[model samples]
Target: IGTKFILAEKFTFDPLSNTLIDKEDSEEIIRLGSNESRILWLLAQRPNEVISRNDLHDFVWREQGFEVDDSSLTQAISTLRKMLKDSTKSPQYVKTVPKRGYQLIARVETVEE
Candidate 1:
């Protein structure tokens, strides 16, 4: 049997491109912004799952052989949240877990190959 994808309300994703498609069908394209492209790329790969801060840092910066500060991480996240129109108090897609990290709490669907 093939896999089926599902979303909570207003989000759809293209696995191949790792792009978040808006259900509203507007011409608007969602982006985590220029500087936060890497962060967006990572989150898109693991949609609907929580990713640890250190893990993200390691994967994006450390593993990539780069030196970045915690503020850089914070800025990337902030830019991403703005692009998604997500709120810290009541996040619609990205949810913050304080010291842990962040999670995409929205439901998603995946298709089997």
Candidate 2:
């Protein structure tokens, strides 16, 4: 099944499906990048916890299929932030603290059968 959850009590996030329910109503869900899904899922696994850049890189890219680029992580990070909070003027979720790691903000829940 596709991954699913309410990201920060707002958007209905489904990383594997690469979808969001769009309670923010931007009309386009495709904006959630391919890698953002990977990043999102990794972070969602431990909400409000910091997952380091290298940790994120290891999970998403594995340092194998794709090499790192200056724009690679930052670009995906920026886009992921902007899209996740398109319903806002600033940030309240998914923060990458300087030189530390990316922190996810969600109380976090599930739909287990």
Candidate 3:
């Protein structure tokens, strides 16, 4: 299969390769876990837009028959933040809206290869 690239300010994501790379440092490549990759892909699809918890739950867990709850979603988000080196207080990529949902604040462009 051909590769698809998602370019952000400081990172490049390859959905086909399931890898994320630092733009300034080529050596900084991270292989994302399935769930992490999926979540990131979803957020990247609609950058700078808020995606509600319900939507995230449905996309990530509903089809798998997994129970959807705030705790699980919080954990997943925490893991993804760690992987992306994002801080909740000073977020560069993922921004959490208190009592609402999360938004991807980075600019994203998709390129098909």
Candidate 4:
């Protein structure tokens, strides 16, 4: 069965399809890249915890048997945050912990499959 996560009570995300479904029907969605889906799924699995950059990189790239740089993760986060309407200025969902890592500050709820 496919698992889903309701992020910030606004949208439901399917990690398998990289699809986002708007809750209010006021809009459609913010589709994600394959890598972005993996990242989001990982963060959703452990909300509120600061996920380290190295761990994130390992999960998204190395674990997939691919090679990349920090730029990829940064870019992915930028897009992911933008999709969630989170800002680096005053993050309401995802927070950046300077030297530590990124944290999912949003409310993540499981949608029974």
Candidate 5:
């Protein structure tokens, strides 16, 4: 399901399938990017909580024995924000907490389970 909502200078789209989701179609579709989808997906599941990068990396990467640098996670977060056309100044979806991690601020309306 795809729903349209404006956050700032861009249109926000809630999509279930990234395969069929296109940013050009609506304005921007939030994308987790490559292996980072799992990370963003888990964070989205939690919604408003500030998920620590260590916790996320441990669960999604370390537990699975994946070797990565902090930049890897940072890059993913950057990509996710760009895909959603979200700004760090006034985040509509992902909010970065100083020395902590990030938060999903957008009100996600689930169309279906």
Candidate 6:
């Protein structure tokens, strides 16, 4: 399998291995579930852009033979935030935009092998 790295300001994610590495120290590696990984990847793909919940739901769940709903998305995002050690009030990576959607606040870079 090939490896792809999604580099954010504070962390780097290796999708193939489903690993999230802390860029600051390299000692913290966070393992993500498939859904969490996919969601993070999507956010990273469109850094600083608002992604609607509907869009995220369609992309991450509907296609995977799962029902899409706000609660599920919220829970997934909540788990992601905890994994990233990010705060909802003062998010360092993902930001909630109230009625609009969510945005990835960090810069993103992609490297493929």
Candidate maximizing TM-score: 4
Angstrom error of the Cα, residue 64, model 2: value is: 8.6
| Top candidate (lDDT) | 4
lDDT: which is higher, 1 or 4? 4
How would you encode candidate 4's per-residue C-alpha lDDT over 6-94 as one tens digit per residue? 88898787776778877876478777875666567567656667777686766756453564343466677788788787766887887
List the candidate 5 regions with Cα displacement exceeding 4 Å.
1-31, 61-71
Q: Estimate each model's TM-score.
A: 0.56, 0.69, 0.68, 0.78, 0.61, 0.68
Q: Could you give candidate 5's per-residue lDDT for residues 76-113 as a string of tens digits? A: 77776776657768776677889987776655544444
lDDT tens digits by residue: candidate 3, 11-33: 77788888878788889987766
lDDT, candidate 1, 1-113, per-residue tens:
22233334665544444355567775655633333544544555666556676666657554535543434667767755664557777777667777777766556556444
What C-alpha RMSD separates each model from the true structure? Answer: 5.3, 3.6, 3.9, 2.8, 5.1, 3.6
What is the total number of backbone clashes in candidate 4?
A: 0
By lDDT: ranked, best first: 4, 6, 3, 2, 1, 5
Residue 61, candidate 3: Cα error in Å is 5.7
Specify the poorest-scoring 10-residue window by lDDT in model 1: 1-10
Question: What residue runs in model 3 are displaced by over 4 Å at the alpha carbon?
Answer: 1-3, 61-71
Sorted by TM-score, highest first, which candidate order results? 4, 2, 6, 3, 5, 1
For model 2, how does the per-residue alpha-carbon lDDT over 1-113 read when each residue is reduced to its tens digit? 45467666666666656776655675757446656666676676665667776876678555355533434566777776766663345566765588886666654555421
State each model's CA lDDT, in order.
0.56, 0.62, 0.67, 0.72, 0.55, 0.68
Q: Write the per-residue lDDT of candidate 6 for residues 1-113, one digit (tens) a residue.
A: 42565554667777778887888878988777756655665665665677777767667554545543334556777876876678768877667888877766655666776
lDDT value for model 3: 0.67
Error of 5 at 74 (Å): 1.8
- Native-referenced Cα lDDT, model 4: 0.72
49, model 6: CA deviation in Å? 2.6
Tell me how many residue pairs clash in candidate 3.
0
Considering only N, C-alpha and C atoms within 3 Å, which residue pairs clash in candidate 2?
none
